[PDB]
Each structure stands twice: as C-alpha cells, then as structure tokens.
Amino acid sequence: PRLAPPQNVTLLSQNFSVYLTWLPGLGNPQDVTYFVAYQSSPTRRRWREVEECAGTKELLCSMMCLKKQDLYNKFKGRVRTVSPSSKSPWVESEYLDYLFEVEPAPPVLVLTQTEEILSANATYQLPPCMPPLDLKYEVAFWKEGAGNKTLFPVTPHGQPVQITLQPAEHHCLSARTIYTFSVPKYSKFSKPTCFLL
Amino acid sequence: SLSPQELASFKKARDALEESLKLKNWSCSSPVFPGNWDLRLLQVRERPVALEAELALTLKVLEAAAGPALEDVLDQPLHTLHHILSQLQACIQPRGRLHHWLHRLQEAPKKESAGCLEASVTFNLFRLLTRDLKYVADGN
Numbered sequence: 442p443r444l445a446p447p448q449n450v451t452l453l454s455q456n457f458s459v460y461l462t463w464l465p466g467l468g469n470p471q472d473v474t475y476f477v478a479y480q481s482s483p484t485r486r487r488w489r490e491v492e493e494c495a496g497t498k499e500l501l502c503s504m505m506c507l508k509k510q511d512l513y514n515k516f517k518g519r520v521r522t523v524s525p526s527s528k529s530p531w532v533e534s535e536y537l538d539y540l541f542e543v544e545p546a547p548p549v550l551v552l553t554q555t556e557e558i559l560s561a562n563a564t565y566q567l568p569p570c571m572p573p574l575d576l577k578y579e580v581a582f583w584k585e586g587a588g589n590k591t592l593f594p595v596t597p598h599g600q601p602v603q604i605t606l607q608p609a610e611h612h613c614l615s616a617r618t619i620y621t622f623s624v625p626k627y628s629k630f631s632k633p634t635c636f637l638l
Numbered sequence: 639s640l641s642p643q644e645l646a647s648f649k650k651a652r653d654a655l656e657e658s659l660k661l662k663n664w665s666c667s668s669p670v671f672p673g674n675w676d677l678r679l680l681q682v683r684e685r686p687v688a689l690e691a692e693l694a695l696t697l698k699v700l701e702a703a704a705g706p707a708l709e710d711v712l713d714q715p716l717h718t719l720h721h722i723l724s725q726l727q728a729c730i731q732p733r734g735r736l737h738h739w740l741h742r743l744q745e746a747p748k749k750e751s752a753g754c755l756e757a758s759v760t761f762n763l764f765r766l767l768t769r770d771l772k773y774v775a776d777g778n
C-alpha cells in the first residue's frame with residue numbers, strides 16, 4: 442500500500458525564521474517518518490535534503506540557515522512520507538520570499554534604572570544567516586493600576602529608550618518590533634516586565 | 639537605505655523578469671557570479687570596486703532586456719540603479735580575488751547567452767541592493 446503524501450504542506454515565517462509544517466497522510470499508520478527537501482539558489486538550483494529532518498517523526502521542520510540556501514530569492518520546500526519499502530509522492534509548499542514575508546519577533550528588553558531614568562534597550566537573538574534587516578521597536582509603558590499606557594516613538598534597533606519617572610507601585614514595560622521592507626510588519630508585544638516602584 | 643516605493647518597484651521588475659525567463663532557455667556553461675560572491679571576502683578598499691562592477695553589469699544586462707513590457711517595468715528601477723551607481727562613483731578612491739572576480743564578470747557577457755545573463759543579474763538583484771550596498775555603506 443503506497444504511503445500517501447503529507448497534507449496542507451505550508452512554508453511560513455515566524456520570529457525571523459522559516460518553518461515547513463504539514464499534516465499526516467490520510468490512510469497512513471502512525472509510526473511513519475518524513476523526509477524534507479528545499480530548493481537551493483536559483484542560479485545553482487536543485488532539491489537538497491534537510492539533514493536535521495531526515496526521517497523525522499515530527500510534523501514540522503526548521504528551514505532556516507540551510508546549506509546553499511539563498512534567502513534573497515524565492516524558495517520552496519517539499520515533504521514526503523517514508524516507511525521502509527515505501528515512500529509517498531513529494532508535496533511541495535508555495536514559494537516563500539523572505540525579505541517580503543519574514544515575520545519579526547518581539548525584542549528582548551534589557552532594563553536599567555538610574556535614579557529617575559528608566560532605560561529600555563531592545564536586543565535580538567538573530568539567525569546567523571539573516572539578511573541585514575532594518576529593525577525598529579516601540580515601547581509600551583504603563584502603571585499597573587492606572588489604565589492609560591504611553592507609547593514611545595519608534596526607535597532603531599541599536600538605540601535605548603529613555604523613560605523619565607515620577608516618584609509616585611508596579612510599573613510595566615513591553616516592546617514590539619517593526620520591520621519595514623516594502624510593507625511594515627509588526628510583531629506581537631514582548632512579555633511585559635513589571636517591577637516595584 | 640532604499641524606500642518602500644523603490645523596493646516595490648524592484649520587486650515588480652524582478653518578478654516580471656522571472657516570468658519571462660520561464661519561456662526562455664537560460665542555462666549557463668558557467669555561472670556568472672562566483673558561488674561565494676561576498677564583499678566581506680575582499681579588503682575594505684576593494685569592496686566599492688566590486689560593487690561598481692556588479693552594478694555596471696546589472697545595468698548593461700537590464701538595459702538590454704527585450705520588449706515593451708519589460709522596458710516599462712524596468713524604467714524606474716533602471717533610474718534608481720543609475721543614481722546608486724553615480725553616487726558610488728563619487729566616493730571611489732598584485733592580482734588576487736578582486737582581479738579574478740572582476741575578470742569573471744567582464745568575460746561573462748562574451749561567453750554566455752542573453753537569457754543566462756538576464757537570469758543572473760535578476761536573481762542577484764536583491765542581494766545586491768540589500769546586502770552588498772549596506773556592507774559598503776558601513777565600512778565606508
């Protein structure tokens with residue numbers, strides 16, 4: 442019984458990275474594996490195997506910083522179901538175009554506190570192969586009780602956000618990333634950091 | 639750093655070129671750009687020269703793209719490319735990597751088909767605009 446292909450094969454970006462995900466083949470047994478491949482650079486193009494997801498039992502595969510991967514151009518992934526003595530047809534994803542489709546992660550806020558100056562600085566753990574994206578961030582600040590929040594101006598990754606305080610309980614900081622290539626993309630806000638004062 | 643409108647313009651051109659290349663046979667006997675093409679492999683002083691060479695090659699090739707449809711979509715991209723080139727040249731200033739890389743790009747138009755050259759510079763376009771331009775602007 443030939444093995445039936447994966448379903449809803451989807452190549453997507455999340456947190457600066459790219460993932461291929463899929464669902465099990467209709468008629469299949471559990472206890473099957475999957476093999477994944479991707480296209481190399483358009484001018485030296487073939488399907489290459491992802492070593493990490495060779496015979497994986499998972500339903501996803503990280504598709505970032507792969508060998509011979511060109512993120513400045515479109516690329517597809519493919520998945521096939523594999524069991525010994527059998528293999529399904531490949532199922533390809535749609536092209537993903539990283540510069541235009543990457544989804545930014547929230548920053549990690551580095552916090553310092555001078556007597557009356559609260560400083561928030563955005564840091565990122567970026568895939569080592571990532572193109573040099575232009576990243577900015579936006580801090581939200583609020584008194585844990587009093588509802589109204591203050592949104593500070595968009596700040597380039599690399600500059601801190603300075604916040605002047607008022608003697609006045611818990612106070613809170615959050616930040617989101619804005620990435621603009623052709624069309625602005627916003628991350629969710631980071632997990633708030635709340636502290637006593 | 640390129641604007642959204644400019645990048646939208648390049649994308650529209652790049653995609654139009656890609657589509658036209660699906661109708662052509664554009665195989666290369668040898669790829670146009672080196673497999674490890676990256677200005678970081680070069681001395682800082684050599685980088686602008688490398689960047690100039692790929693810019694000139696890109697212009698040469700795209701300015702020859704055939705048919706009204708492509709000329710139309712390439713019109714504004716060619717204009718932005720001309721401006722980037724000219725700005726680069728107003729900032730500019732024994733055989734090794736730079737020399738060999740320069741040779742490869744100069745010789746390519748003589749040895750390869752039009753489709754092949756068209757394919758090469760189109761697929762090189764966003765790396766050029768995004769990576770190569772930035773590294774040069776940083777190192778100065």
Ligand SMILES: *[C@@H]1O[C@H](CO)[C@@H](O[C@@H]2O[C@H](CO)[C@@H](O)[C@H](O[C@@H]3O[C@H](CO)[C@@H](O)[C@H](O)[C@@H]3O)[C@H]2NC(C)=O)[C@H](O)[C@H]1NC(C)=O
Nearest residue numbers: 549550551560561562563564565566597598599600601602
């Ligand atoms: C606020 O946060 C930003 C972002 O993290 C800080 O920028 C980084 O801070 C230092 C600057 O030298 C470095 O961590 C980053 O640059 C790099 O330093 C490493 C260590 O040698 C090397 O890879 C290079 O030297 C590289 O330049 C730097 N990032 C950038 C984009 O400059 C920033 O310092 C911090 N606060 C302040 C006041 O800058």
Ligand SMILES: *[C@@H]1O[C@H](CO)[C@@H](O)[C@H](O)[C@H]1NC(C)=O
Nearest residue numbers: 447448449450451463464465
């Ligand atoms: C893809 O999967 C989704 C949800 O799993 C489903 O709704 C959709 O029908 C699938 N696509 C096709 C073409 O069947």
